[model samples]
Target chain A: SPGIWQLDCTHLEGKVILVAVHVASGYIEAEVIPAETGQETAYFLLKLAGRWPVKTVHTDNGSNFTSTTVKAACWWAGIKQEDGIPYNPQSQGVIESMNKELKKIIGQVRDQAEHLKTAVQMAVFIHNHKRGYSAGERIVDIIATDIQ
Target chain B: SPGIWQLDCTHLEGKVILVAVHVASGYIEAEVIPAETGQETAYFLLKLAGRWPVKTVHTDNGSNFTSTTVKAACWWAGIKQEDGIPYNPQSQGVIESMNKELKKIIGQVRDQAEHLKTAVQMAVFIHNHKRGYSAGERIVDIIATDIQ
Candidate 1:
């Protein structure tokens, strides 16, 4: 599987970066900031809660997770953040399925970032509306109708 | 294939008890008790001569490979030992191939570990002699004449 690597500071200019993503829905949320410390993580958390409903956050233990700033964000957000061991580099597990789906969907959008984002949004939308968890039942129906 | 975790413990309890055969082979010839240090890794290397040549050895990197003991082991045996990244629970890749093989073999041995050992040894022997890596010709046919 392809991996996401840290971008250089020069390459990150004007990019409203989102780090970890939701697989079933191509939901992107900000994770880390280039050339910025843990304080930026707190700002991203506020942005995330205002825009989307996130229940869980997973991370490998880098300096970002260990800093007091990130823990504070998790504590305030009512979101749980899970960290694997320090220095072992494994991507979030959800990212694997996202990697496969995005490859097919993003190819249709090509190099158009806005188009790509739109396609991802649409992909996520369709996926959420039609997708089932384990059993063959639509979650969108469940969400809209409040079915158990 | 299941890996045989062989150690070169300095307190292993015998003179030159160096061989431990699992999926691939592991040897530690220099110790008679709990391995207090990494230097004995070389003694295990020499035991590999004329038995089975190893391509990779996975180990913890706590002064073992970087230490003279392990370096000497590699130098003597001309085999390489790789240190896994710190804190990954299961190092190396896990695949279902060995599990499939072990399932049938385990039944043949009736779940007894000693018989399972024989089952594995026979499996390897039959595997090398009968199986072809590509389409034609056997693996044992490839390695046996060279070693013999």
Candidate 2:
């Protein structure tokens, strides 16, 4: 439950925003895509499998999720999408935290906004390389064994 | 001026401060040494010269400059120590500017007060290798080349 999940969106800006994040460990995968209608949501949903079988997906209730394409995705993946609480975004706390941490490092390494594209690779590298987890008295270094 | 200039104290906790800044471009080299005596200062200053003769030296009127040992060393090396105004530290503007830039980048990369040492290395590398100056190109890039 506190590991990783994906977030998808089609907002007023005309692009779909998708992200997968760990609930507790603060790992993340984020991307922006084009899913103008439900026609594209299904394609995006299909992209989520082949790693772990997603048991449940929590997403905000939006037209993108209600679309026919997304409906098929849910049926195929067998993951029920839970709408975020009416006005609270902390429901996606891991995603938000990862964004903040990523931006801080990126801001330091990139001199200008244009250099940000280059920094994304370095940001992901530093994130997975150094982030560690503790189990009881033991610390475990977790690298993405499989990116999928 | 090209490779790394490594200087440290007798122990890791010893404080040795050495600086190497390109005279024409303002590229910086600020370091700490373990030994605090005048001989240690002389050692750092001589290392800063590398193969080039230091034409001028600018420093605050700290006892390091006024001390007889430092005076004799500068005299032998034909280096002029430009003394600051009795009460003004601002004359050492070059080093001051570098300190501010370094600290700001460090603050940007790592959490304030956490991972302090790692932040220092990251800041210097980004500043030297990646950051551009508002007045022109990066100081590191500008050194030794005539620009229009």
Clashes of each: 12, 8
What is the model-wide C-alpha lDDT for candidate 1?
Answer: 0.37
Q: Residue-wise lDDT of candidate 2 within B1-148, one digit each (tens)?
A: 2222222222222333344554444444444455466665654454344222355665534766677766754664556766534345553564566666766775686662233433443444445444224211223233212211
lDDT tens per residue, model 2, A1-148: 5223555342323444444443344444343455445644444444343122345665545775677666766765566766555355565564556667766766665552233333443344345434233220010112111211
DockQ of each: 0.01, 0.01
Best TM-score goes to which candidate?
2
Give the lowest summed-lDDT range of ten residues in model 1 chain A. Answer: A1-10
Among all windows of 10 consecutive residues in model 1 chain B, the one with the lowest summed lDDT is B131-140
lDDT of 2 at A141: 16
lDDT of 2 at B21: 50
lDDT of 1 by residue, A10-87 (tens): 112333233444423333432224544565654454334322234565543366567677677566555566654324
What are the Cα lDDT values of the candidates?
0.37, 0.45
Report the lDDT tens digits of candidate 1 across residue range B1-148.
2222333221111222222323331112111223435544543343332123345555444576577766755554455666644345442232133334434543554442233333333333322223214101222122323333
Measured with C-alpha atoms, the lDDT of residue B10 in candidate 1 is 15
